[PDB]
Amino acid sequence: ARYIGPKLKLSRREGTDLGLKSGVKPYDVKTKKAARPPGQHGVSRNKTSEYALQLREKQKVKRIYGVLERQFANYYKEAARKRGATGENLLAMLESRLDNVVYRMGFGSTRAEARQLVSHRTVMVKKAGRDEFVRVNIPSIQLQDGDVIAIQEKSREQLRIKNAIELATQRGIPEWLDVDHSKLQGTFKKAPDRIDLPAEINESLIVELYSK
Amino acid sequence: ASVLTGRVVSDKMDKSITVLIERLVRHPLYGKQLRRSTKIKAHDENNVCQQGDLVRIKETRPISKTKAWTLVDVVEKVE
Amino acid sequence: ATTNQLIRKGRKTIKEKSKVPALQACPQRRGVCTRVYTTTPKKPNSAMRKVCRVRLTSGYEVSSYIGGEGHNLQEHSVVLIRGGRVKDLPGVRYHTVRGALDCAGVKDRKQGRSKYGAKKPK
Amino acid sequence: GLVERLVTVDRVAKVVKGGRIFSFTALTVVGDGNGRVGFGRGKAREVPAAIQKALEAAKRNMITVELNDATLHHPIKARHGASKVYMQPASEGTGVIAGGAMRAVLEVAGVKDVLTKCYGSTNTANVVRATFNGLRDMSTPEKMAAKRGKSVDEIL
Amino acid sequence: SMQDTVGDMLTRIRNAQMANKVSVAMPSSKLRKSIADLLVSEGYVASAVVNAEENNKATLSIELKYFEGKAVIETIQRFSRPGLRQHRGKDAIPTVKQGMGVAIVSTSQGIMSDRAARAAGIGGEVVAFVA
RNA sequence: ACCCUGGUAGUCCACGCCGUAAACGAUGUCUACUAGUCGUUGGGUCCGGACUUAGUGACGCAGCUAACGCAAUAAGUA
RNA sequence: GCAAGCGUUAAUCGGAAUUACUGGGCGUAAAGGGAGCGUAGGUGGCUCGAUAAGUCAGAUGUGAAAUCCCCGGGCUUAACCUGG
RNA sequence: GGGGCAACCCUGAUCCAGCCAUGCCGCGUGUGUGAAGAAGGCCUUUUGGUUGUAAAGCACUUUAAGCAGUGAAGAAGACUCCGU
RNA sequence: AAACUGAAGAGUUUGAUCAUGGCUCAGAUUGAACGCU
Numbered sequence A: 001a002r003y004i005g006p007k008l009k010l011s012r013r014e015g016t017d018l019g020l021k022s023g024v025k026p027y028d029v030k031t032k033k034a035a036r037p038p039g040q041h042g043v044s045r046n047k048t049s050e051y052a053l054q055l056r057e058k059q060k061v062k063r064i065y066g067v068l069e070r071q072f073a074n075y076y077k078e079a080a081r082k083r084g085a086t087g088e089n090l091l092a093m094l095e096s097r098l099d100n101v102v103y104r105m106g107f108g109s110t111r112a113e114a115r116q117l118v119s120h121r122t123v124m125v126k127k128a129g130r131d132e133f134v135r136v137n138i139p140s141i142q143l144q145d146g147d148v149i150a151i152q153e154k155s156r157e158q159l160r161i162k163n164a165i166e167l168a169t170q171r172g173i174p175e176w177l178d179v180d181h182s183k184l185q186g187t188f189k190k191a192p193d194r195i196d197l198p199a200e201i202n203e204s205l206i207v208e209l210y211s212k
Numbered sequence B: 001a002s003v004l005t006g007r008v009v010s011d012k013m014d015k016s017i018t019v020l021i022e023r024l025v026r027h028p029l030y031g032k033q034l035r036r037s038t039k040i041k042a043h044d045e046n047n048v049c050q051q052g053d054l055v056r057i058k059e060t061r062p063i064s065k066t067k068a069w070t071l072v073d074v075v076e077k078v079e
Numbered sequence C: 001a002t003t004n005q006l007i008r009k010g011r012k013t014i015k016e017k018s019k020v021p022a023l024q025a026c027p028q029r030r031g032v033c034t035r036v037y038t039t040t041p042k043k044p045n046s047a048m049r050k051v052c053r054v055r056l057t058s059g060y061e062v063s064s065y066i067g068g069e070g071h072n073l074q075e076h077s078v079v080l081i082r083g084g085r086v087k088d089l090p091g092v093r094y095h096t097v098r099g100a101l102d103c104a105g106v107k108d109r110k111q112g113r114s115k116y117g118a119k120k121p122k
Numbered sequence D: 001g002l003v004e005r006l007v008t009v010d011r012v013a014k015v016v017k018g019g020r021i022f023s024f025t026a027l028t029v030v031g032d033g034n035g036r037v038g039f040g041r042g043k044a045r046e047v048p049a050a051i052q053k054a055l056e057a058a059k060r061n062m063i064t065v066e067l068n069d070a071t072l073h074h075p076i077k078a079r080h081g082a083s084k085v086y087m088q089p090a091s092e093g094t095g096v097i098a099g100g101a102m103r104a105v106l107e108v109a110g111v112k113d114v115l116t117k118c119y120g121s122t123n124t125a126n127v128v129r130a131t132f133n134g135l136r137d138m139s140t141p142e143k144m145a146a147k148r149g150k151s152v153d154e155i156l
Numbered sequence E: 001s002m003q004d005t006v007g008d009m010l011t012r013i014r015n016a017q018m019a020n021k022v023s024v025a026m027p028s029s030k031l032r033k034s035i036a037d038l039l040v041s042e043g044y045v046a047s048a049v050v051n052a053e054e055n056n057k058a059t060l061s062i063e064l065k066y067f068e069g070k071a072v073i074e075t076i077q078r079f080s081r082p083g084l085r086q087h088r089g090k091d092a093i094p095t096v097k098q099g100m101g102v103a104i105v106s107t108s109q110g111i112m113s114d115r116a117a118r119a120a121g122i123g124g125e126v127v128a129f130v131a
Numbered sequence F: 001a002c003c004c005u006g007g008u009a010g011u012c013c014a015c016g017c018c019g020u021a022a023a024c025g026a027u028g029u030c031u032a033c034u035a036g037u038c039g040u041u042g043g044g045u046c047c048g049g050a051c052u053u054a055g056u057g058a059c060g061c062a063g064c065u066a067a068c069g070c071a072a073u074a075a076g077u078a
Numbered sequence G: 001g002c003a004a005g006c007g008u009u010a011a012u013c014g015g016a017a018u019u020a021c022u023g024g025g026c027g028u029a030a031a032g033g034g035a036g037c038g039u040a041g042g043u044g045g046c047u048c049g050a051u052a053a054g055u056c057a058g059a060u061g062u063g064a065a066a067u068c069c070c071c072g073g074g075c076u077u078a079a080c081c082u083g084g
Numbered sequence H: 001g002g003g004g005c006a007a008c009c010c011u012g013a014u015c016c017a018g019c020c021a022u023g024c025c026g027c028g029u030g031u032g033u034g035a036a037g038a039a040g041g042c043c044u045u046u047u048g049g050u051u052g053u054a055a056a057g058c059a060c061u062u063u064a065a066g067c068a069g070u071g072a073a074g075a076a077g078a079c080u081c082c083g084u
Numbered sequence I: 001a002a003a004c005u006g007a008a009g010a011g012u013u014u015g016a017u018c019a020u021g022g023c024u025c026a027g028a029u030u031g032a033a034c035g036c037u
Helices: A009-013 A029-031 A050-065 A071-078 A086-095 A098-105 A109-120 A159-171 A204-207 C004-007 D047-060 D100-109 D124-137 D139-150 E005-018 E030-043 E114-120
Strands: A123-124 A147-151 A177-180 A185-188 B003-013 B016-027 B032-042 B056-066 B067-076 C028-039 C050-057 C061-066 C077-083 C095-097 D001-015 D018-030 D038-044 D062-064 D076-080 D083-089 D114-118 E023-027 E045-053 E055-062 E076-078 E100-105 E110-111 E122-131
Touching: A009 B067, A050 A071, A050 A204, A071 A086, A071 E110, A086 A098, A086 A204, A098 A109, A098 A123, A098 A147, A098 A177, A109 A159, A109 B016, A123 E055, B003 B032, B003 B067, B016 B056, B016 B067, B032 B056, C004 E055, C050 C077, C061 C077, C095 E076, D001 D047, D001 D100, D001 D124, D018 D047, D018 D124, D038 D047, D038 D100, D038 D124, D047 D062, D047 E122, D062 D124, D076 D124, D083 D100, D100 D114, D100 D124, D114 D124, E005 E023, E005 E055, E005 E076, E005 E122, E030 E045, E030 E055, E030 E100, E030 E110, E100 E114, E110 E114
Parallel strands: B032 B067, C061 C095
Antiparallel strands: A123 A147, A147 A185, A177 A185, B003 B016, B003 B056, B016 B032, B056 B067, C028 C050, C028 C077, C050 C061, C077 C095, D001 D018, D018 D038, D038 D062, D076 D083, D083 D114, E023 E055, E045 E055, E076 E122, E100 E110, E100 E122
């Protein structure tokens, strides 16, 4: 299951831009909101609490990457078992998802559209070392160092992809991804660092939330 | 093979003695070593050793219902 | 407690018994309603709470609480009984599952329908 | 250039001929986030004045703490009366695993990764004070080596 | 009566340091001298000497240290007591203050620090924690 | 009932039972160590005092305690 | 907030350091036996030796496989399977 | 695994299939774009707010399901012939 | 090379307080049942 309802509602509840809409126009004018969360009341009295700051922070990442609670808690459980910082590991494994990778490489305008592309077998993956591609309809595929991504031979003429590259160019392309627009082919050279990821997501709140 | 030492607490059976083997068992939760003791009947063929003696005994085939150890050495004797 | 005292005696926990003995460690239990009546609650509250004395298949004859507004239970009615004590009712320690066997769901319920056995309205 | 956080606010009363006089008590913890930390509580008939008075007292009840650049130097067990607190250093990325009163002091003192636990009474002021006592009694390897007259290599 | 000689030694040291005494004296023993020498070489006390008294008796005198007016021996606690002895292997010797303190260990090679016993790869009876 | 006037068991003795009290310091016993001041009891040794012992009191640090309070006769440190 | 599931009930551990070994208490909060003597037991001064049972270290044999954990490999991913 | 020299026979072990959200894991129920911010509902100080880019409209996509094809691997090469 | 990583509290006795102390809750789990779907 995935969220289907409105996305500006989510952005307004998180109080920040989650990139759920395309960058074709500024977030402020797309909604004339984000100064108040959704509903009749919006900005409220009776200020939040530590648990509210933690819950909202976890929901922020979950809504950004489009991952529900069960899969996200499996992510945190894996991250707290891998070596190093749990939040750093959780951000790395959320960034290494196939749908997020294709969104950053720019073949999709939003992560929802990137997941829609991945799910419909329009993206082939080539595992590191393997001399073959394979069509994969699973957005939650974790990509390792060196995995190649390419667009299907019967979907390179997509209009949505061609207008997704030109948005990716206007937004910026990560340095841990080597994407070529000439034949719609990227390479996941390395999982991004915490210094490469934006310094406004407090993964420490997520780690403290998953500690009762 | 499997030798065991202890004091003789009974000798009032024909060709038979009771040896008190002591051991230190450690408590699984509190870690203090309690001293525990088992009575083992041994076979003393010539019926020589008396109570209060230190004796070594080894496991063998059973001689009787409750006797499967045999005397091999009277290391110490009553003063 | 010295170490020698702990070895000689040892610290024992009492295991508390269940608060729902009539269920016999079962989630629900079937019974027949031997008496459907109303009773007054404890000191602070004031109402006519709906209760049914029900003899279960375990051999107990406990009193249970019918939740929701309005019910159809009478003598010789077969109900399913779940755990859960009513605070202001002295003696009542079980709830009647509404909508399970013979106890109907609540008529006009809309919000918490699953807790009262009400089908989703079309 | 100082960080402040209000930990608890309580409503207390005094009895008089007319009735009950209701006042407010606020406990706050101030800190630089780099090792300087302090706590204080204030009383006033109004919550904002109690909060300002607590902040003023916290700014004067301050100590300096030498952290292990993210965490503590050694396990600490401290107490103030009936609150017993225990903190131990944790690996980087662990977070401050603490209740409200412990978390306030540790986070405002700059600790990032620590394991904690409260035993005895969890009175907010006494837990804050026990955590404060432990942080002020905490030692450093350099200080221990200097006290013994050796080097940090001579004292692993 | 007195059934913990090591406990009495450490209690005398602790009370003298709490009272800010210059030195603490007691009846001597080789075990007490071993523990006192370990304290000296660890730097917790200045010196520990035995003076042979009459009637085949001896007095062990330990000169205490103070740093910035505070006692150098912050805490000195007995771990293995006569009512419950604690013997550990080489990989179970408990550390004191994350290695800043010393766990005095009685090993087959004599009284030595926890880190010394770990380096020698040998366990023993963990008699005290001094930090 | 309290108060008054009487009043029997009991209180007294001998020999036995009972085995309980707010039988209390509401503080088990034993050992070592830890500022001090002033009383008192029974000894002891020195020059009316000085010291030292074993009790028995009142204070009072450090320490302890939720607080009251304890504090060499600990509820301190073991 | 979860989501093809969501709640309720039952049951176990946790939180509970609320049986405290790790890790609690007993003047007044529950808690010192009315006091003693003493049996089993527990514990126990200094010095020089012996022994090596406890203790510690090493070696060998064993502690089945599966499971738990680590490094990998195969399922489109994952669960799952699987080598060391 | 049982019997037989074999052919082969037997095997509700086993390998499978059926049912059940009982659990775990996975995927979907669309994706972009869309304001005088439509209507309706709700609140409201009666005119604003909220539902809300949400819908409608437009532009695309077809995972899974449905239909049609194709199509590994699980098989260990029995028997028979030849040679040593 | 690795198997070496882990520890949160809250409500409720009082006019208020600190302590004691029970009760209750937030978690995880299941060969689960029931209700809605």
